[PDB]
Design an enzyme around this catalytic site. Structure first.
Site, mmCIF file in Angstrom:
data_model
loop_
_atom_site.group_PDB
_atom_site.id
_atom_site.type_symbol
_atom_site.label_atom_id
_atom_site.label_comp_id
_atom_site.label_asym_id
_atom_site.label_seq_id
_atom_site.Cartn_x
_atom_site.Cartn_y
_atom_site.Cartn_z
ATOM 1 N N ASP A 118 0.849 -1.185 0.000
ATOM 2 C CA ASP A 118 0.000 0.000 0.000
ATOM 3 C C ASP A 118 0.886 1.238 0.000
ATOM 4 O O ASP A 118 2.020 1.209 0.486
ATOM 5 C CB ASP A 118 -0.952 0.013 1.209
ATOM 6 C CG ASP A 118 -2.126 0.973 1.040
ATOM 7 O OD1 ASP A 118 -1.960 2.065 0.455
ATOM 8 O OD2 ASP A 118 -3.233 0.627 1.500
ATOM 9 N N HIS B 288 -52.424 32.329 -0.081
ATOM 10 C CA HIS B 288 -52.911 31.632 -1.270
ATOM 11 C C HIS B 288 -51.745 31.238 -2.170
ATOM 12 O O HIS B 288 -51.684 31.604 -3.347
ATOM 13 C CB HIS B 288 -53.927 32.489 -2.023
ATOM 14 C CG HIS B 288 -54.736 31.729 -3.030
ATOM 15 N ND1 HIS B 288 -55.694 32.329 -3.819
ATOM 16 C CD2 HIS B 288 -54.736 30.418 -3.370
ATOM 17 C CE1 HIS B 288 -56.245 31.421 -4.605
ATOM 18 N NE2 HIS B 288 -55.682 30.254 -4.353
ATOM 19 N N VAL C 47 -19.559 -2.369 -28.042
ATOM 20 C CA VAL C 47 -20.535 -3.443 -28.145
ATOM 21 C C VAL C 47 -21.908 -2.832 -28.380
ATOM 22 O O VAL C 47 -22.256 -1.801 -27.788
ATOM 23 C CB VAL C 47 -20.504 -4.310 -26.872
ATOM 24 C CG1 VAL C 47 -21.571 -5.399 -26.900
ATOM 25 C CG2 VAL C 47 -19.120 -4.908 -26.664
ATOM 26 N N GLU D 26 -27.801 -4.692 -22.845
ATOM 27 C CA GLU D 26 -28.680 -4.954 -21.707
ATOM 28 C C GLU D 26 -30.024 -5.495 -22.179
ATOM 29 O O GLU D 26 -30.600 -6.406 -21.566
ATOM 30 C CB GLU D 26 -28.864 -3.673 -20.894
ATOM 31 C CG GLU D 26 -27.578 -3.154 -20.269
ATOM 32 C CD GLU D 26 -27.382 -3.632 -18.849
ATOM 33 O OE1 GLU D 26 -28.393 -3.819 -18.144
ATOM 34 O OE2 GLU D 26 -26.219 -3.819 -18.437
#
Lengths: 368, 905, 364
Positions: free
Chosen positions: B121, B492, B629, B633
């Site tokens: 890390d 109002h 592509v 879906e």
DNA sequence: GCGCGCCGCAGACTGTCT
DNA sequence: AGACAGTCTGCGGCGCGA
């Protein structure tokens, strides 16, 4: 129509005759007014500061045109190629710039006429023949410069075009109310002009790119300043874009030129007093505001005193940034009235702060 | 063969079955909700010699493909799993970069780590660039601190090269580096920015925790706020938000991991970082040890819950990504920032002009009949023959020296007197350092930017006093629809009935196209504003992320021979690369999430910096070969459709269309049906994707509220027939029994590879009333599994056939590879074969071993030098071809010939 | 003594060896160099000070710039150009600008074409002359003429380093009532620099019809016929006055109006890099009027040897030390004017003391 | 869906100016 | 002994990172 008679009324245009459209654009106009010579001095100096002195490379070309009158302003610049590459420093990249007056043939009224155009031409010596990024840099500079000082910068557009031998180029347009008109052209001449001018030897035409001697390409950027001034006047006032009733119910004719391009900045006045001692302090203020770069309009010299509304409308139509009115109270308190072109409201300020505030306003307008 | 427009079985043609009692039901169903009489002209036949498969079945072929590779990586992971590490070395030292620590603290200088498996890390200082500052590399052999040579006072002044750590041991092997957010670590490994491929691969613990026992966006919010609406709290304890010191106690169990309150790495001084070394080293070592323990807990669980090797190999492939910049990234950032500043100054100047024009009122009290400027203050308050050089300057000097007499105050208390109060508020004081001319310091966030431009919403005050977001400004004796309509609003109000509850996050960036919301009828300066806002909105949102992306410029030595002495090579320019820092799983659906890249950016016009996707330019001698592509879906939902009610891609009307349908002509069902039933002004795609994910009727209704001026009762009674017509209900064209049946099933979720859902959404002790996220996960995870099937292929095609490349980039249903210019046709053919094999694999898992020719190949395989949506597109900038060289691209829909992939021909 | 080849090393390839006393007074010559163009612009600004400061209702005008004029219609490639006919054409408009206040003038700097004849043929001159037309009442014509002669003599002697040689001669009167001529004494005698002609109303009454309606602007509440007195000046150079003699001083031009020898930016960084120590003086280019020659772009240390002889040619008024000795302390300025004094630069000698010594000389 | 920043805006006090 | 410039400070909203 209304804009042109407004200009000639306050003498930003030349003369009453041949005032109609495509006569000033052609260049056969009689000239410009006394305030019209200015903004041809404000322009060609802002262009000069932006192009010539700021860029360390760009240097002024030799004086052109010392038979046929000049038309392109480009032939002489290439004629002075040999002296441009100085012996002490023969650096290829730096180029040439000039501002001058060019003569064009005009047909369709018969006898051939001569049109006069104020042309700013910059010829750039790009060391690679296929770099094409110097053109993009100069396009960005020219476009942001024209959009600078503009009330509506969106009207300054650019269009790509190509010619024979497929030279690559850009043509700046300004959207006048009748239609788009050509302002500035960028063209890759493609080194063929240098070969045509100097067909004897090629060794003189080589310049040092980095460490190596290469034949340069020349890039011509030619803009017009008379039609540029017409674009700046048409950008101010109104170009019939707004029109309508509820948009602007007020009827004010004002020429909102940029403070850095306005012809005359401050207009001195005398009013609200019969003493005539105010002429002395107005002359003193006149001498004070000069030699600081500020040009003043001596409206205090006039004997007749018209209405304040007419004077304010006249100053707005003359592109006066700030109107100074000196009352008799200035003899006691020193407070002068100041009116702005942008905001019609007027305020009282001391005379001592006036010059400093005006020079600070002009400087900050130049920066922004 | 010509039953539904299908092709012959090139592979696995020994046994064929058309089924029985299924064609009649399919034909009877397609009689309704479909014309069914389409001639369906065939695509021209393509027949080629595929590379030799293994196992005599495509599933086993992909199994051996995914097991031949990622086997040294798997054994390296097992060796890292079996290790019993020493606790810590007490001694930490600088030791000039890398050094080796055994079980005890002992200083010895070593050049590079010679270890296969490794957990690593990197901690960086945000105050000083993006250069790495701290790093420790834990291995079964040693401890390997790096320290990033920070003791040296001199810096490189950006232009990162050779500065970070090194881990590749050189030929003169395989390495699976583990870490938490291992993509950010991967940015600091070095030789990952090299153009030639590296054998090293990376696995993310965050991807492991997000793939299994991950949290949905709503779930994460609930877990955060909790550290019908009520349900069993099992998923609350089972999952976590993916931050460490929260995952560690979940998997490993024990004391909580430390959290430094100071946070010196993100907001600390350089000298503060230089000292206090040992505590920061201890914190980093504890962080890496916790990451190692979490991976040790997670690896057998991930292997059990994701058994099929294509998933792991695809995650390993997505761990390695490469985006070259070709030295124009800095120029792009400079021009984008300059354009943003210029348009900001233009909009501010337009605001100043509008304020000045408004200030021209008050002469004769021209306000209070203007509906916009009626309610402002508008108040006034006030409280030589002879050289005569003297008497002119002397009088002015006397008046200047007379400043003290009768002056109200030495420091001016009247800030521009005589101007209206709102204009005084918009003006800085006359002090010289802070003076700016005109009505400056004016922005759109202020309430005074409205009422200067009309906005055309009748009376548009934006009076933020009990407004709660919006009021009576939509439609209908001044209470009725009047242009003014603003006085005594409290008794109002009426207007908007939903009150507050909208997200109100850039909601008004749309609705400028129609929908009222026009900044003044004029055209001069008003409508120019809110069009500049459209252009600069994207850059204003994303200029933090687009800038400060870490770029490592490869020196001349690091560049390969292909770049050198190339015609498109320049000595002055220095070529670099960007690692996208994508996490291989950032959502419960295991698709990569990264804010900068992987968005719906396609160089859209009227935008300043939407050319993010462009200027990812290949180095000279290299090209980007890649394909977008086709809309997938919808195809995934269709193939989940068939083999449930019937096979052969013909059971339902959804299966009948969407594949022969084209955008150019006919109905492709993506927009045509939506714009027939509803308005669907370009929003048809969002509505269809929401239907596919099973969002439901309330989400669809709320989405349609923001698009038209349709009433709620009118929305319920009318134009909601899309749900009533597409879906019959709960058990026509759309069906959801397969997706729901998968959702109720516990373990077998993925039909293709068998990848299990995260434990938060499992039905064991967890009931989901909302139901949308699980079916959305099924669709999107099937798409992810399709992507993994593509990515496991195109490998051993670059190995057995000598092809240089295999640097995958996946943005949004598309793939890109950095291939050499000599092998671009081979890469295109390999990508086409990969698409064919992937579609056949998905169909084979979901039923029958035959594929239609329409979806069997890509429409076009884009070979370019940069990355763009289409080859025939340019950015919104004034000159895209000018400057940087562009070849304008070629489509390559059809290959050059029928010739095979091996070099001999 | 010739000063065109010895002192003026920077020259033009065209007629490089053909430069003498002839063809320089006349306009048949190749144009001026960049230094010459910038010096002409500076001289035009200094002449324009008489337009902006001596604002006795004086306004600028622009001529049509045509060599023959606006054609020749209806009358029975030109003898001369003087920028005067444009002023008399703009008489009506510029009198409409004021409230017919007669004591006002119109000034213009422009190109005037003169045909060259009997060369030792029909060549174009382009002598870039400057004109003032000065519409005046007839009674005060002599006083206004003497006024303008006195201020023109003062303005031309203001930049003159040496006394005399800006002579004024009454000569004769043939074009008008009276006039005066200014002569500069080159080594080839005295030649004309500026001329005065009290034309009178003759030209204005000739150009317009006999009946008058827009003419005779009011002065002293009585409309009177306007007199015209014209000031015409050839924008020649004071380069001969710059180098009076060489003697032991070896060939130095004193920078009274020179754009160069008051400049900056030279040095290019002392340690062959980090030029922002000198290039960072580019703020003198913004908001100021200091012309700076980028000598730092040369970066040729071999050519910079023999500093005493390099000051003769380059002369950017200071240079940074090549050896890395005085990088610190914030001082690089040296060799100011004649004697090196070598003082601090940040606020003392750069952006200040360069604006000074020029405005003070302007006031003197 | 939340939380912690960054702006606008209206206080309630503070501090000379009388 | 009033009274309106300005200085923190408590509110709403916008917005971006998980």
């Amino acid at each position: 129509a209304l804009l042109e008679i407004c200009q000639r009324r306050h003498f930003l245009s030349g003369s009453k005759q041949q005032l109609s459209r495509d006569s000033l654009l052609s260049g056969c106009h009689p000239g410009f007014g006394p305030l019209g010579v200015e903004l041809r001095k404000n322009l060609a100096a802002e262009w000069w500061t932006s192009v010539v002195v700021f860029r360390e490379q760009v240097f002024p070309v030799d004086a052109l045109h010392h038979g046929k009158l000049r038309e392109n302003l480009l032939h002489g610049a290439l004629e002075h190629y040999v002296n441009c590459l100085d012996l002490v420093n023969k650096r290829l990249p730096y180029g040439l710039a000039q501002i001058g007056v060019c003569f064009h043939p005009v047909f369709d009224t018969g006898v051939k006429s001569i049109g006069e155009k104020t042309e700013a031409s910059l010829v750039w010596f790009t060391p690679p023949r296929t770099s094409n990024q110097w053109l993009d840099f100069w396009l960005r500079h020219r476009l942001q410069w024209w959009r600078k000082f503009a009330m509506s910068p969106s009207n300054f557009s650019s269009s790509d075009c190509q010619d024979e031998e497929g030279r690559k180029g850009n043509k700046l347009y300004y959207n006048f109310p009748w239609g788009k008109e050509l302002i500035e052209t960028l063209w890759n001449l493609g080194d063929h002009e240098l070969l045509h001018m100097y067909p004897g030897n090629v060794s003189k035409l080589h310049g040092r790119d980095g460490r190596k001697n290469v034949v340069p390409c020349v890039l011509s950027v030619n803009g017009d300043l008379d039609r540029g001034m017409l674009a700046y006047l048409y950008d101010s006032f109104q170009l019939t874009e707004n029109s309508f009733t509820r948009k602007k119910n007020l009827h004010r004719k004002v020429l909102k030129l940029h403070p850095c391009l306005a012809p005359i900045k401050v207009a001195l006045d005398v009013g609200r007093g019969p003493t005539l001692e105010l002429r002395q302090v107005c002359q003193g203020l006149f001498n004070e505001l000069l030699e600081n770069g500020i040009s003043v309009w001596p409206g205090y010299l006039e004997t007749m005193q018209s209405s304040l509304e007419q004077l304010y409308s006249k100053y707005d139509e003359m592109s006066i940034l700030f109107t100074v009115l000196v009352t008799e109270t200035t003899l006691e308190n020193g407070l002068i009235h100041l009116r702005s072109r942008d905001t019609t409201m007027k305020e009282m300020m001391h005379i001592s702060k006036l010059k400093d505030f005006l020079i600070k306003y002009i400087s900050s307008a130049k920066n922004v | 063969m010509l039953s539904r427009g299908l092709h012959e079985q090139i592979f696995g043609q020994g046994g064929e079955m058309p089924g029985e009692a299924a064609v009649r039901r399919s034909v009877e169903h397609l009689q309704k909700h479909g014309l069914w009489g389409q001639p369906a002209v065939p695509l021209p036949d393509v027949e080629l010699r595929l590379p030799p498969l293994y196992g005599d079945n495509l599933d086993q072929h992909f199994r051996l493909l995914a097991q031949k590779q990622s086997l040294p990586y798997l054994e390296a992971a097992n060796l890292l799993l079996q290790a019993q590490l020493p606790p810590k070395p007490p001694a930490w030292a600088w030791a000039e970069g890398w050094t080796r620590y055994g079980p005890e603290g002992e200083a010895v200088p070593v050049a590079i780590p010679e270890e296969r498996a490794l957990v690593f890390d990197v901690e960086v200082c945000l105050a000083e660039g993006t250069c790495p500052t701290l790093a420790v590399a834990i291995s079964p052999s040693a401890w390997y601190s790096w320290c990033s040579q920070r003791l040296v006072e001199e810096r490189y002044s950006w232009t990162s090269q050779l500065s970070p750590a090194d881990l590749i041991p050189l030929e003169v092997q395989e390495q699976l580096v583990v870490g938490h957010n291992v993509s950010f670590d991967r940015a600091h490994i070095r030789e990952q920015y090299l153009i030639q491929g590296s054998r090293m691969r990376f696995l993310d613990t965050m991807s492991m925790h997000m793939a299994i026992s991950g949290l949905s966006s709503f779930q994460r919010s609930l877990w955060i706020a909790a550290k019908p609406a009520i349900s069993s709290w099992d998923w609350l304890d089972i999952s976590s938000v993916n931050s460490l010191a929260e995952v560690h106690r979940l998997y490993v169990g024990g004391p909580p991991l430390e959290k430094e309150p100071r946070e010196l790495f993100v907001k600390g001084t350089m000298k503060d970082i230089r000292e206090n070394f040992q505590d920061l080293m201890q914190y980093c070592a504890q962080d890496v040890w916790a990451t190692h323990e979490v991976f040790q807990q997670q690896l057998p669980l991930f292997l059990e819950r994701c058994p099929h090797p294509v998933t792991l190999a695809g995650m390993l492939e997505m761990g390695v990504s490469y985006l070259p910049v070709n030295q124009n990234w800095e120029r792009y950032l400079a021009e984008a920032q300059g354009t943003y500043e210029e348009l900001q100054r233009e909009m501010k100047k337009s605001l100043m002009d509008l304020a000045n024009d408004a200030c021209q009122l008050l002469s004769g009290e021209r306000y209070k009949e203007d509906p916009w400027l009626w309610d402002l203050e508008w108040d006034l308050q006030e409280f030589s023959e002879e050289e005569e050089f003297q008497q002119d300057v002397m009088a002015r000097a006397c008046l200047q020296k007379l400043k003290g007499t009768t002056e109200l105050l030495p420091k001016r208390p009247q800030h521009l007197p005589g101007h209206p109060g709102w204009y005084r508020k918009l003006c800085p004081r006359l002090d010289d350092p802070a003076w700016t001319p005109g009505p400056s310091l004016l922005s759109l966030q202020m309430r005074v930017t409205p009422k200067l431009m009309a906005l055309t919403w009748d009376g548009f005050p934006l009076h933020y006093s009990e407004r709660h977001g919006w009021g009576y400004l939509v439609p209908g004796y001044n209470d009725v629809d009047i242009p003014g309509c603003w006085f005594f609003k409290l008794p109002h109000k009426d207007g908007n009935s939903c009150n507050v509850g909208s997200p109100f996050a850039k909601d008004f960036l749309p609705k400028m196209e129609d929908g009222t919301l026009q900044a003044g009828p004029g055209g001069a300066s008003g409508p120019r504003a809110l069009e500049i806002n459209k252009m600069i909105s994207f850059w204003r949102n994303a200029h933090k992320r687009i800038s400060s992306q870490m770029v490592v410029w490869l020196p001349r030595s690091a560049l390969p021979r292909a770049v050198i002495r190339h015609p498109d090579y320049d000595e002055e320019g220095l070529y670099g690369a960007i690692l996208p820092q994508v996490v291989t799983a950032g959502t419960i659906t295991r698709r990569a999430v990264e804010p900068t890249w992987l968005t719906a950016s396609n160089a859209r016009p009227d935008r300043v910096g939407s050319e993010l996707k462009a200027m990812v330019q290949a180095p000279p001698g290299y090209t980007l070969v890649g394909a977008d592509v086709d809309s997938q879906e919808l195809w995934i939902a269709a193939v989940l459709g068939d083999a449930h009610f019937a096979g052969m891609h013909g059971c339902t009307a959804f299966g009948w269309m969407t594949l022969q349908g084209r955008k150019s002509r006919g109905t492709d069902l993506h927009s045509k049906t939506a714009t027939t039933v509803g308005i669907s002004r370009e929003h048809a795609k969002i509505f269809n994707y929401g239907r596919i994910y099973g969002a439901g009727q309330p989400f669809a209704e709320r989405l349609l509220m923001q698009f038209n001026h349709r009433l709620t009762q009118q929305e319920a009674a009318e134009k909601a027939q899309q749900m009533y017509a597409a879906t019959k209900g709960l058990r026509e064209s759309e069906m959801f029994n397969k997706l729901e049946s998968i959702a109720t099933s516990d373990i077998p979720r993925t039909p293709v590879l068998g990848c299990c859902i995260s434990r938060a959404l499992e039905p064991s002790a967890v009931q989901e009333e909302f139901m949308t996220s699980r079916v959305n996960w099924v669709v999107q995870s099937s798409a992810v599994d399709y992507l993994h099937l593509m990515l496991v292929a195109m490998k051993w095609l670059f190995e057995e056939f000598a092809i240089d490349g295999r640097f995958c980039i996946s943005i949004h249903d598309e793939v890109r590879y950095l291939v050499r210019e000599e092998d671009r046709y081979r890469a295109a053919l390999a990508l086409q074969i990969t698409n064919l094999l992937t579609r056949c694999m998905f169909a084979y898992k979901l039923g029958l071993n035959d594929l239609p020719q329409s979806v069997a190949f890509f429409s076009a395989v884009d070979i370019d030098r940069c990355l763009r949506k289409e080859v025939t597109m340019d950015c919104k900038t004034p000159s895209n071809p000018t400057g940087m060289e562009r070849r304008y691209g070629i489509p390559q829909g059809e290959a050059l010939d029928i010739y095979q992939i091996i070099e001999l021909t």
